[PDB]
Amino acid sequence: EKIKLEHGAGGEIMEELLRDVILKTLTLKSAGGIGLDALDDGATIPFGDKHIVFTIDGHTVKPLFFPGGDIGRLAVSGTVNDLAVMGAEPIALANSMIIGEGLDMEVLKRVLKSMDETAREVPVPIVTGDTKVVEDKIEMFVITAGIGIAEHPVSDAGAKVGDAVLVSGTIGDHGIALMSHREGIAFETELKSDVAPIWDVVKAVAETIGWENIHAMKDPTRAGLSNALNEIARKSNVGILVREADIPIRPEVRAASEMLGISPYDVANEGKVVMVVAREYAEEALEAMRKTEKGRNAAIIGEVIADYRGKVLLETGIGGKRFMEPPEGDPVPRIC
Amino acid sequence: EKIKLEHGAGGEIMEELLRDVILKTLTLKSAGGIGLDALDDGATIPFGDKHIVFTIDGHTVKPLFFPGGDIGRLAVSGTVNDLAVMGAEPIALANSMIIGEGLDMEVLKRVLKSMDETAREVPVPIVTGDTKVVEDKIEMFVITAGIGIAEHPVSDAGAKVGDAVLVSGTIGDHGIALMSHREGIAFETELKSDVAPIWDVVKAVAETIGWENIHAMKDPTRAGLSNALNEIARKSNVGILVREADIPIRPEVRAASEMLGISPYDVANEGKVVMVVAREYAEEALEAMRKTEKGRNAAIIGEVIADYRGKVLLETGIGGKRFMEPPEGDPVPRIC
Ligand SMILES: Nc1ncnc2c1ncn2[C@@H]1O[C@H](COP(=O)(O)OP(=O)(O)OP(=O)(O)O)[C@@H](O)[C@H]1O
Ligand SMILES: Nc1ncnc2c1ncn2[C@@H]1O[C@H](COP(=O)(O)OP(=O)(O)OP(=O)(O)O)[C@@H](O)[C@H]1O
Ligand SMILES: [Mg+2]
Ligand SMILES: [Mg+2]
Ligand SMILES: [Mg+2]
Ligand SMILES: [Mg+2]
Ligand SMILES: [Mg+2]
Ligand SMILES: [Mg+2]
Ligand SMILES: [Mg+2]
Ligand SMILES: [Mg+2]
């Protein structure tokens, strides 16, 4: 039995590896709060009357620089976003870099500059790190860990029947932009990745409706919106009913995804949050998102239902319904 | 200008890159305590009346399994040790793995088992992680971040004139064991790496003499004892006078290092701490170390002096003195 690319593709195949190998082999998995067995965006640790939130992501995107971003902006954004979707204000990042021998120094400088500019947007400091250089022909991997503070951690398992389901903006941008760049597809300008830190979007909603009314969040990275919704449904043991027409998709992303034969629901996003909120606070949450720049295209896309537990339904036409199937993996290689 | 293997070798060449490129490019570098500009084993953040300590290390050792350890034991030990030498009790680890397509699943299982066994020694939980798979022929990289709590952070810059300098055990074991394994050198058994978590050793000293009397620590990883001592001397702006005969070296390590033509002072250790303590507490500190299993071979090896600031002197014979020169880099490739 060998490790396959699919094991790193973030959908059902990776999930099987996490449950059957990682969780079964490691025994000390919690520091007192949300731990490894939860398989959430991060872990939580009680500290005083608040919670430390801890997360880590490796980044292996190709190419290192792409329209709308780069591995540096991705490394800061992805880790800030994992903290944000746990309800945590980012307070520190750690930066591990593994660099291929022969990489031009200017590339390292460019990546670091992008990391700093992105971190300044949050704002969050990069307070510690590590540098390794290998003879392997890898260009560069960047691995960022993050610490945040949450007064009220938000899980991916807390969705309740009746809740509204929101997305903070258009879906499919990162994965489709990346594939379009590789394939020479472009319109008046190249499609841009959405990679960006979105703590400001989450914070805006919390300040408006209160943490208690944010019932679940995930950032729809590898394997996309579909994976994120299926995970929330499964872990919350509820059904999710989505109106397909209400999912925001950039016209250029729709067109390119058609040319590529790739579903925009199944590819990583890098500047988005999926949020599940108390029914009576849905419109307030939506308005709070839309008042921000990064949440300007936010939409309510569905609702949590009591039947079809652990499933996601897509509503089309005048009422017709089918399943939004959880991908086996993100179809875009080296997407993150 | 290109990135060279030396930039990942942990001595003067890497230090130049950190100062001239990393520190000059990143602008947000501190979360309120020891930050990136200190270039210490980790960073610190005020929280209540204590401090959160944060660290990260990538691990790229070859081979993945070696006498005395493996990349999994190394990943847990190295990050626990970086927390320990900041004065921090480990409370959580994060585990990023980047795996080469085609690696046998049993290798991943073995690495995870070793991580768990090592973590259980501390004890510390692995609470969050990430898995990426790349087509590159790398086998596996493991990147661990750690969070600890320190009541009283210990820097690498706090050495005071008159202080005693201790090491917790024999020097050179990891690097020399690794090179000996690669080269087919062995005695009755193969030389073993010392890779192990040593929070218990540091804690033992603190419980005996108090944190205030531990003035500086570093773990002598890449570029060895020499690098660690030179760093403490430079950052504390003091001289360090070492009695060469008092530095514990395993007889087999001495012999092998002679055959290899490599200095045991210049290669990474993975189960050791260099500690600088108040003069009047030196013997108590030494006794506390020696009562532990992992510190059983601890020795007082020198003292901090007012002249030769930023330098390390080696005393031999009946009083003769030369410089212990800071290495340009660890001479052992892929040592960590
Ligand atoms: N090698 C590993 N060791 C320990 N835990 C892991 C490992 N890989 C993944 N995990 C855990 O599995 C769960 C799912 O991880 P995943 O990386 O999909 O989360 P994510 O970062 O939110 O998504 P993405 O990596 O696509 O951004 C998380 O709780 C994570 O902590
Ligand atoms: N790519 C990077 N980005 C930010 N900070 C870095 C980076 N590489 C190293 N650092 C910082 O440089 C200092 C020296 O790092 P180094 O990795 O030598 O520490 P160490 O982990 O104690 O040693 P070793 O890696 O050999 O175990 C540390 O303070 C670390 O936080
Ligand atoms: Mg995921
Ligand atoms: Mg996530
Ligand atoms: Mg992530
Ligand atoms: Mg390091
Ligand atoms: Mg070092
Ligand atoms: Mg260190
Ligand atoms: Mg280290
Ligand atoms: Mg991840």
Side-chain angles (χ1 to χ4, degrees), chain A residues 1-136 138-150 152-242 244-290 292-336, chain B residues 1-136 138-150 152-242 244-290 292-336:
Chain A
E1 185 186 11
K2 311 295 186 182
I3 287 286
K4 299 169 181 165
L5 293 175
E6 285 87 346
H7 287 119
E12 302 304 297
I13 294 167
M14 186 183 80
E15 189 75 18
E16 173 178 76
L17 174 71
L18 296 175
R19 300 198 182 268
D20 298 347
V21 176
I22 282 68
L23 293 186
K24 283 184 182 163
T25 304
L26 303 184
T27 66
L28 303 185
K29 286 177 286 183
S30 170
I34 300 178
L36 200 63
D37 290 308
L39 296 176
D40 212 332
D41 300 277
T44 72
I45 310 176
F47 199 132
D49 65 333
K50 307 204 170 188
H51 305 261
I52 293 166
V53 180
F54 193 18
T55 195
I56 195 168
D57 256 333
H59 305 278
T60 57
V61 68
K62 286 299 201 57
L64 302 187
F65 288 81
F66 49 83
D70 54 76
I71 192 165
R73 181 165 185 85
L74 179 63
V76 168
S77 295
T79 289
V80 165
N81 292 351
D82 272 316
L83 291 172
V85 299
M86 294 306 301
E89 176 176 15
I91 67 169
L93 303 182
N95 175 39
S96 159
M97 296 175 130
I98 303 176
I99 305 169
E101 178 187 20
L103 191 75
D104 197 284
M105 190 67 72
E106 290 301 322
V107 170
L108 171 62
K109 289 175 179 183
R110 270 192 84 196
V111 171
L112 287 166
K113 180 176 174 285
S114 189
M115 290 184 79
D116 195 66
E117 294 172 353
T118 305
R120 288 180 72 86
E121 298 179 13
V122 181
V124 67
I126 296 166
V127 302
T128 199
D130 186 56
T131 303
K132 295 288 197 295
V133 177
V134 296
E135 71 272 18
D136 307 72
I138 57 162
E139 300 184 38
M140 185 189 304
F141 303 150
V142 182
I143 305 88
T144 49
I147 294 177
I149 298 303
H152 181 288
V154 176
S155 75
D156 60 3
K160 299 303 176 55
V161 174
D163 286 355
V165 179
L166 289 68
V167 301
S168 63
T170 56
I171 297 302
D173 296 70
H174 175 76
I176 300 306
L178 194 68
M179 282 302 303
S180 299
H181 178 65
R182 292 180 182 158
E183 298 295 328
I185 300 174
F187 301 91
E188 296 75 39
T189 55
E190 278 191 294
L191 276 183
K192 305 292 187 284
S193 169
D194 67 342
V195 57
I198 46 58
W199 163 243
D200 65 317
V201 177
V202 176
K203 186 185 180 184
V205 176
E207 291 180 335
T208 299
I209 71 172
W211 289 111
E212 58 275 7
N213 296 310
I214 301 173
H215 295 172
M217 283 183 290
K218 283 213 84 68
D219 58 329
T221 47
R222 277 178 290 176
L225 178 65
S226 176
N227 177 81
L229 291 174
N230 274 278
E231 280 301 277
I232 294 171
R234 197 176 51 81
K235 290 178 155 172
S236 301
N237 194 33
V238 294
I240 294 176
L241 174 66
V242 179
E244 187 163 17
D246 294 342
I247 301 174
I249 308 182
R250 200 166 294 278
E252 292 81 4
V253 172
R254 198 184 301 272
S257 67
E258 292 289 342
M259 297 183 274
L260 292 162
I262 293 170
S263 176
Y265 307 145
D266 293 354
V267 304
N269 305 275
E270 299 293 343
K272 301 286 144 54
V273 58
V274 173
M275 186 187 291
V276 180
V277 309
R279 182 186 196 85
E280 66 274 28
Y281 286 95
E283 289 291 337
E284 290 197 50
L286 178 64
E287 182 179 339
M289 283 190 183
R290 292 183 63 89
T292 69
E293 178 67 20
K294 288 167 178 169
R296 72 197 179 280
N297 295 318
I300 300 170
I301 68 164
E303 70 179 299
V304 180
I305 60 173
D307 35 9
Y308 302 94
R309 292 164 331 207
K311 312 285 183 165
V312 181
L313 281 62
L314 269 169
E315 178 181 313
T316 55
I318 63 184
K321 296 161 174 56
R322 74 192 191 279
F323 291 111
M324 183 184 273
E325 305 288 4
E328 291 295 291
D330 199 307
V332 178
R334 302 296 291 270
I335 188 165
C336 304
Chain B
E1 185 186 11
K2 311 295 186 182
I3 287 286
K4 299 169 181 165
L5 293 175
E6 285 87 346
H7 287 119
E12 302 304 297
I13 294 167
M14 186 183 80
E15 189 75 18
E16 173 178 76
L17 174 71
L18 296 175
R19 300 198 182 268
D20 298 347
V21 176
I22 282 68
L23 293 186
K24 283 184 182 163
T25 304
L26 303 184
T27 66
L28 303 185
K29 286 177 286 183
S30 170
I34 300 178
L36 200 63
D37 290 308
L39 296 176
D40 212 332
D41 300 277
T44 72
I45 310 176
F47 199 132
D49 65 333
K50 307 204 170 188
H51 305 261
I52 293 166
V53 180
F54 193 18
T55 195
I56 195 168
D57 256 333
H59 305 278
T60 57
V61 68
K62 286 299 201 57
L64 302 187
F65 288 81
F66 49 83
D70 54 76
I71 192 165
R73 181 165 185 85
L74 179 63
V76 168
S77 295
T79 289
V80 165
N81 292 351
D82 272 316
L83 291 172
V85 299
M86 294 306 301
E89 176 176 15
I91 67 169
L93 303 182
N95 175 39
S96 159
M97 296 175 130
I98 303 176
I99 305 169
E101 178 187 20
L103 191 75
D104 197 284
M105 190 67 72
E106 290 301 322
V107 170
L108 171 62
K109 289 175 179 183
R110 270 192 84 196
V111 171
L112 287 166
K113 180 176 174 285
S114 189
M115 290 184 79
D116 195 66
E117 294 172 353
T118 305
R120 288 180 72 86
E121 298 179 13
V122 181
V124 67
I126 296 166
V127 302
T128 199
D130 186 56
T131 303
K132 295 288 197 295
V133 177
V134 296
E135 71 272 18
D136 307 72
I138 57 162
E139 300 184 38
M140 185 189 304
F141 303 150
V142 182
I143 305 88
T144 49
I147 294 177
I149 298 303
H152 181 288
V154 176
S155 75
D156 60 3
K160 299 303 176 55
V161 174
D163 286 355
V165 179
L166 289 68
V167 301
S168 63
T170 56
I171 297 302
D173 296 70
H174 175 76
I176 300 306
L178 194 68
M179 282 302 303
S180 299
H181 178 65
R182 292 180 182 158
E183 298 295 328
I185 300 174
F187 301 91
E188 296 75 39
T189 55
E190 278 191 294
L191 276 183
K192 305 292 187 284
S193 169
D194 67 342
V195 57
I198 46 58
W199 163 243
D200 65 317
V201 177
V202 176
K203 186 185 180 184
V205 176
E207 291 180 335
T208 299
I209 71 172
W211 289 111
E212 58 275 7
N213 296 310
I214 301 173
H215 295 172
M217 283 183 290
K218 283 213 84 68
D219 58 329
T221 47
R222 277 178 290 176
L225 178 65
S226 176
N227 177 81
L229 291 174
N230 274 278
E231 280 301 277
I232 294 171
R234 197 176 51 81
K235 290 178 155 172
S236 301
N237 194 33
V238 294
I240 294 176
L241 174 66
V242 179
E244 187 163 17
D246 294 342
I247 301 174
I249 308 182
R250 200 166 294 278
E252 292 81 4
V253 172
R254 198 184 301 272
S257 67
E258 292 289 342
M259 297 183 274
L260 292 162
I262 293 170
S263 176
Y265 307 145
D266 293 354
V267 304
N269 305 275
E270 299 293 343
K272 301 286 144 54
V273 58
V274 173
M275 186 187 291
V276 180
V277 309
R279 182 186 196 85
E280 66 274 28
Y281 286 95
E283 289 291 337
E284 290 197 50
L286 178 64
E287 182 179 339
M289 283 190 183
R290 292 183 63 89
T292 69
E293 178 67 20
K294 288 167 178 169
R296 72 197 179 280
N297 295 318
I300 300 170
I301 68 164
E303 70 179 299
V304 180
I305 60 173
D307 35 9
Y308 302 94
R309 292 164 331 207
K311 312 285 183 165
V312 181
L313 281 62
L314 269 169
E315 178 181 313
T316 55
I318 63 184
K321 296 161 174 56
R322 74 192 191 279
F323 291 111
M324 183 184 273
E325 305 288 4
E328 291 295 291
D330 199 307
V332 178
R334 302 296 291 270
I335 188 165
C336 304

